[PDB]
Design a protein around this ligand. Structure first.
Ligand SMILES: CC(=O)N[C@H]1[C@@H](OP(=O)(O)OP(=O)(O)OC[C@H]2O[C@@H](n3ccc(=O)[nH]c3=O)[C@H](O)[C@@H]2O)O[C@H](C(=O)O)[C@@H](O)[C@@H]1NC(C)=O
Ligand SMILES: CC(=O)N[C@H]1[C@@H](OP(=O)(O)OP(=O)(O)OC[C@H]2O[C@@H](n3ccc(=O)[nH]c3=O)[C@H](O)[C@@H]2O)O[C@H](C(=O)O)[C@@H](O)[C@@H]1NC(C)=O
Ligand SMILES: O=c1ccn([C@@H]2O[C@H](COP(=O)(O)OP(=O)(O)O)[C@@H](O)[C@H]2O)c(=O)[nH]1
Ligand SMILES: O=c1ccn([C@@H]2O[C@H](COP(=O)(O)OP(=O)(O)O)[C@@H](O)[C@H]2O)c(=O)[nH]1
Ligand SMILES: [Cl-]
Ligand SMILES: [Cl-]
Lengths: 360, 362
């Protein structure tokens, strides 16, 4: 009998936790407690993932969201701690690299509760980025580090973290892709409702703060996607912050010139990803998923944490400096492909994690 | 020209800030803002330090204290971010390794405000200590790391922190002792008041969570000091956390078997330290201060961050497993001296810090 308490806050964490929860569910002598920090609150950012991915209802929802870093983090720290004091888990699992992730780790470590980091050791090497700080501080607060890549392992060793607390387990998001592919296949009619042809479109997601808070970068991107749309339709589930920023800066018309959508659930997303001729993104999960389905990817950033995708030629960096340049880069890359290679493990990262926990 | 905001919360942070602030006041094109988190709030833990050490009143008093790690840290995080969004300083200075330190660094780093850590790189290698977490995360959040010892430099290098963000400046608490030494001698009457001669007592402080939150460890300590007291008087300024714990555990009667005091001010503390035959402590700062005055030290812990003191034989660990043994260790070490050696620098650590903050560049 071991109690594993998972802290999730964001869309990409709900998806990671869905792979790990399934395994821990069906593990003998494990009880899972699941805390939702409230970081993502809208149904199309949260509840749709609990439904379609068959994720047990949270034991707690802390309903903390939409504030500053200080506010969100500070309140998550107090609220999570209150729950940890009540539930007394053997392990706390935190996922990815949001304020939720860091609050979870920090609440736990002060209570002497072992912390494991699912997706550990990724580095952008840009310490100005809030997500890089969250990655570093979470890894340094954690007791176990579940690395998805060799790079991530080397990143952790370089910062003095001992071999014996690092387990290279692959990526749980590959697990989720594998497990949920069939259900996506039978439930999603998004190509239908969108009148899209398999391989008859490009899929875009953009929501990095460094791309959306900056008017000139955001303009370069929305201009580039509208141009690209002249040649091949662009489907664009628009993050809510991205949509806020584009409206605020007067760039809302570029959204009208492509096939812009509200955020979609995981099953639609899998189907849009699978059937895309090419994926343009600044998302971590989406750039790996592009590779899952062997769709060429362009990453609209100056760097990625997922360097093996660049080495394998499945992914290509295009910083948003020039709208025409960005447009051509996207159009050129859609008739490329990368090498045959298996990354991210066998789709059993979650049971490797289960195993290492109930042992350690 | 440049605005530098210090975050402080607890006694040892007001002493460190005293030393640094004095220098920054002399520096041209340097405005300071001091945020007192409210972590320490009793007058004998906060106000007395501002007064005797000549520190200007805090620009802000957040009045946070007395909660859990979660509550204190969380509330401090949100509150400090508020001040920073108003003040928009060029630097945030954080000190040591309390919950206030961490909350200061976390508030700042997410606002893209450069953080410098005064007293960076110390490691106990014991994560159960909240303090060990606070200094790991603070160091990893910081843009400048003011390390007091080579060990601390080596700690930071080992954790992947680049050499160009690390500066070995020595310890601003040596600067503090050096600068306030004459004032303490001139003004303190604590010896007169207690009726102590020089070398006629042992000084004790205890306040680690690991020593006070555990009934039987605390009993071991209080009992050991009572025994020591029978052979050489024990003076014991008692931390409010320690008193509170001693009371709740029913251990208060032990404090009557030594010369138990409320916390004393820095000036009185110098005089007590300086004239003690031996210091026994679980304090960080008191360990170094014992060495400043060449008084043997016993550290009632399983480890210290100040390892150089063990190597020079000025300090000795004595984890509290047994009262008889701990007493005997204390009495035995009263007769010892370390090796002559200069540590902690030249007493101008603050000047080095000031210089780096000014010349670091945008
Ligand atoms: C740059 C960065 O730090 N990123 C971190 C960030 O993730 P991320 O950038 O992937 O955000 P995100 O794109 O919202 O999610 C994608 C998922 O949403 C699905 N997705 C996407 C759009 C959509 O409409 N519907 C949908 O189902 C996709 O199919 C996909 O499964 O938060 C993550 C977390 O803390 O767990 C970190 O692991 C990441 N760190 C890394 C290193 O990749
Ligand atoms: C073990 C540990 O983590 N310790 C950390 C902790 O300090 P510390 O353990 O020294 O607490 P503490 O003993 O209350 O203060 C001593 C001072 O009070 C004076 N003092 C003491 C008693 C008294 O009655 N009067 C008086 O003036 C003394 O004369 C002396 O100058 O908080 C510090 C901070 O965050 O800045 C960190 O730098 C420390 N890290 C280290 C590594 O030493
Ligand atoms: O359900 C949600 C979640 C987020 N957002 C918007 O997205 C922003 C960024 O949210 P997030 O929690 O992802 O912040 P990050 O982790 O990127 O700092 C929020 O301030 C909101 O404007 C929203 O509108 N609805
Ligand atoms: O001026 C003060 C500061 C603290 N405390 C008590 O000491 C405890 C510990 O304070 P803190 O969390 O700052 O830790 P510490 O001072 O022991 O490092 C608090 O919870 C209070 O009960 C007090 O009585 N007076
Ligand atoms: Cl998105
Ligand atoms: Cl004390």
């Amino acid at each position: 009998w071991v109690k594993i308490l998972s802290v999730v806050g964001a869309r990409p964490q709900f998806i990671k936790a869905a792979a790990v929860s399934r395994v821990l569910r069906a593990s003998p002598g494990v009880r899972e407690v699941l805390v939702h920090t409230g970081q993502h609150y809208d149904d199309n950012m949260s509840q749709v993932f609990f439904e379609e991915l068959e994720i047990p209802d949270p034991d707690y929802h802390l309903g903390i969201g939409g504030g500053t870093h200080g506010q969100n983090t500070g309140r998550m720290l107090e609220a999570i701690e209150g729950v940890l004091l009540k539930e007394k888990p053997d392990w706390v699992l935190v996922y990815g690299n949001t304020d939720s992730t860091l609050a979870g780790a920090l609440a736990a470590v002060k209570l002497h509760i072992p912390v494991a980091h699912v997706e550990a050791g990724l580095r952008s090497f840009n310490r100005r980025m809030p997500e890089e700080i969250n990655r570093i501080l979470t890894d340094h607060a954690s007791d176990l580090l579940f690395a998805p890549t060799e790079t991530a392992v080397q990143n952790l060793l370089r910062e003095g973290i001992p071999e014996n607390r690092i387990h290279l387990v692959g990526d749980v998001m590959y697990d989720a892709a594998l497990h949920y592919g069939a259900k996506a296949e039978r439930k999603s009619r998004i190509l239908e409702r969108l009148g899209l042809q398999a391989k008859g479109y490009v899929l875009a997601t953009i929501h990095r703060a460094e791309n959306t808070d900056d008017q000139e970068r955001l303009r370069v991107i929305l201009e580039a996607l509208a141009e690209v749309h002249q040649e091949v339709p662009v489907v664009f589930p628009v993050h809510p912050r991205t949509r806020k920023r584009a409206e605020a800066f007067g760039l809302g018309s570029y959204l009208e010139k492509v096939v812009a959508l509200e955020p979609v659930g995981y099953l639609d997303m899998v189907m849009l990803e699978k059937n895309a001729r090419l994926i343009v993104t600044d998302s971590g999960g989406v750039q790996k998923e592009a590779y899952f389905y062997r769709v060429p990817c362009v990453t609209v950033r100056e760097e990625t944490e997922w360097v093996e995708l660049l080495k394998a030629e499945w992914n290509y960096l295009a910083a948003p400096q020039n709208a025409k340049d960005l447009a051509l880069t996207i159009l050129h890359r859609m008739r490329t492909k990368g090498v045959e290679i298996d990354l991210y493990g066998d789709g059993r990262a979650s049971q490797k994690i289960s195993d290492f926990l109930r042992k350690v």
